[PDB]
Amino acid sequence: YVKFEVPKELAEKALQAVEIARDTGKIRKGTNETTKAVERGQAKLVIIAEDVDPEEIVAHLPPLCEEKEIPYIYVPSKKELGAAAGIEVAAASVAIIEPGKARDLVEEIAMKVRELMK
Helix, strand or coil: CCCCCCCHHHHHHHHHHHHHHHHHCEEEECHHHHHHHHHCCCCCEEEEECCCCCHHHCCCHHHHHHHHCCCEEEECCHHHHHHHHCCCCCCCEEEEEECHHHHHHHHHHHHHHHHHCC
16 A cells, blocks of 8 residues: 655654644544544645555555545554554554644645655
């Protein structure tokens, strides 16, 4: 379900955005609230771990985000995504609803992702 190669640098910035939005804004953890946020257009950025297994758990997110035109990016570790999201365990996906202080960072990420997709 990984549709493009994310530079290590950009992935770290996405984890930074999640950390910041976590402390200063509003984020959703887990595929259920992430999916719902995308469908309702509430998500400003969706972060998806590349190591989810079964894949079916998050496989629907890339196509859904494209269908709804919501920015999305992959991070290599669900463990680190969960950590950035504030939990000690893995998080398959996260949705940033309110960037908080990460408003600009999210926009930079969305812009760079737009290019990766061409």
